[PDB]
């Protein structure tokens, strides 16, 4: 190629990308742990 | 002497702080700064 | 030097060019310092 | 020592300890599980 | 029957675990105040500002 | 027909003002729950915080 | 194009909210085909013809981007007076000849956003196209032209208006409905790693790192 590219070209540019498998979320993060104790516990105030 | 190195002491009370230099004469420094323990902007304000 | 020494002697900078054309560089590599 | 007892007073280890536990309690000796709920 | 993991006796806790709850408290009451705090700060100025820490 | 006018102008106004107090009164008790809301997660040590 | 100087006005809306030129818009936003409002300045009926393109779309295999039609119509005829035109109605109410209908924008995970380019091109009096000429331009095309469809069909690009789009919470679903594939790749950025080859380390502490030195380790072990 021969710089400066004629301002009427199309831009020359190029992808830089991989192609991988898409990483599907799954929902099945437990609420106790492996001690037998809940993972969190939530509280709410009163007025 | 003439220039002096403060703390800024975050008022999240999460114990992180800032250093600036600034001169003697000048007013405390007091900025709007992110805390990274709560990663979040908080007030700053000059320790002493 | 001279009748009183001064030792004058600083670090090279080493600028100009640092890649010529037509060389295969990859992103983040320095062509030209100035 | 604490640490010690703690490791094996706990199910997740399988600790020959853990039975001296309850269903609710915790492994450590300081720490406990609070409870949740508007109170 | 040694001290903390004895018969009857208590584990006492390093200095960082007793006062655990009292320091995340700390911190909880001065968010909640964060928004009031810099209206305050925005309102009065950087240069009027007095209630410095200490 | 002037006062009918201003009468829709008034209605269509304090309507707002009153369905505008009726949001403010919601979000004000979204925030109340949210702030007050603690959630104590398992850290380590078994230590909840 | 080479050089593009509007002479009539295009604005594009979706499910009659008007869309600001070249915001990104969700993929559940732009699953149906939007309402055009042009103006044209000069007297005289006309016909327009209405081109979508897809400029940015990857090809992996060749390390490049293509480009894709999303939406072709012709024989569109617009006076100064007509305001709305639907292109989803350009068949059946509006006169027209669609040669590709409505295809739902979408972007792959992992790629940069897509400019979903909106072309109004004019067609010279008395140049109907014809609808057959028209579908088998896109029957073996996968990298449409813009430049090639109009030096062949003589037409003169008159209005333009863009949008974005890039992979969204809703862009899976919206490819399952129309049976798009791709939604299960992913792009990573491509590594570009030193061009240097492994050497030997220099230094006084870093010679002697072996076992030979096993009575010097107190000054090659553990430096911060
Ligand atoms: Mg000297």
Not at chain 4, 18 to 35: D, I, M, N
Not at chain 7, 52 to 77: E, M, Y
């Amino acid at each position: 190629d021969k710089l400066p590219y004629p301002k009427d070209a199309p831009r020359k540019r190029k992808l830089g990308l991989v192609a991988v498998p898409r990483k599907v979320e799954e929902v099945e993060k437990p609420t106790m742990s492996a001690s037998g104790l809940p993972l969190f516990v939530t509280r709410h105030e009163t007025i | 002497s003439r220039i002096i190195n403060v703390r800024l002491i975050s008022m999240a009370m999460t114990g992180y702080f800032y250093t600036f230099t600034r001169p003697r004469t000048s007013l405390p420094m007091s900025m709007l700064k992110y805390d990274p323990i709560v990663r979040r902007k908080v007030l700053f304000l000059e320790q002493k | 030097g001279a009748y009183r020494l001064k030792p004058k002697r600083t670090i090279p900078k080493k600028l100009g060019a640092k890649k010529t054309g037509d060389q295969y560089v990859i992103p983040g590599n320095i062509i030209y310092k100035q | 020592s604490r640490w010690d007892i703690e490791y094996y007073r706990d199910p997740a280890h399988r600790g020959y300890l853990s039975h001296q536990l309850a269903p609710g309690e915790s492994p450590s000796l300081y720490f406990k599980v609070p409870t949740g709920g508007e109170k | 029957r040694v001290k903390g993991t004895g018969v009857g006796e208590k584990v006492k806790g390093h200095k960082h675990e007793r006062t655990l709850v009292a320091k995340m408290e700390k911190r909880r009451e001065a968010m909640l105040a964060m928004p009031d705090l810099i209206r305050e700060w925005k309102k009065v100025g950087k240069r009027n500002w007095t209630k410095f820490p200490k | 027909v002037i006062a009918e006018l201003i009468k829709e102008k008034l209605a269509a106004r304090a309507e707002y003002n009153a369905r505008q107090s009726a949001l403010r009164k919601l979000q004000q008790q979204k925030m109340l729950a949210r702030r007050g809301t603690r959630v104590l997660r398992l850290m380590n040590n078994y230590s909840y915080r | 194009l080479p050089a593009f100087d509007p002479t009539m006005d295009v604005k594009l809306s979706f499910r009659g909210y008007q869309v600001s030129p070249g915001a990104i818009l969700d993929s559940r936003v732009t699953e149906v085909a939007p309402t055009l409002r042009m103006q044209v300045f000069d007297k005289g009926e006309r016909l327009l013809t209405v081109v979508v393109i897809d400029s940015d779309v990857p090809d992996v295999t060749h390390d490049n981007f293509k480009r894709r039609c999303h939406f072709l119509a012709a024989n569109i005829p617009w006076d100064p007076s007509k305001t709305v035109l639907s292109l989803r109605s350009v068949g059946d109410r509006v006169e027209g000849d669609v040669g590709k209908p409505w295809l739902p924008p979408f972007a792959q995970k992992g790629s940069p956003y897509h400019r979903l380019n909106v072309f109004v091109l004019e067609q010279k009096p008395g140049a109907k196209i014809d609808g057959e000429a028209l579908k088998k331009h896109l029957e073996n095309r996968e990298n449409f032209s813009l430049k090639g469809f109009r030096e062949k069909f003589d037409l003169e690009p008159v209005g333009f208006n863009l949008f974005r789009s890039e992979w969204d919470e809703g862009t899976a679903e919206v490819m399952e409905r129309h049976g798009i594939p791709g939604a299960e790749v992913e792009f990573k950025r491509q590594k570009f790693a030193s061009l240097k080859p492994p050497r030997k380390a220099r230094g006084w502490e870093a010679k002697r790192q072996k076992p030979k030195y096993k009575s010097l380790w107190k000054y090659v072990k553990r430096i911060a």
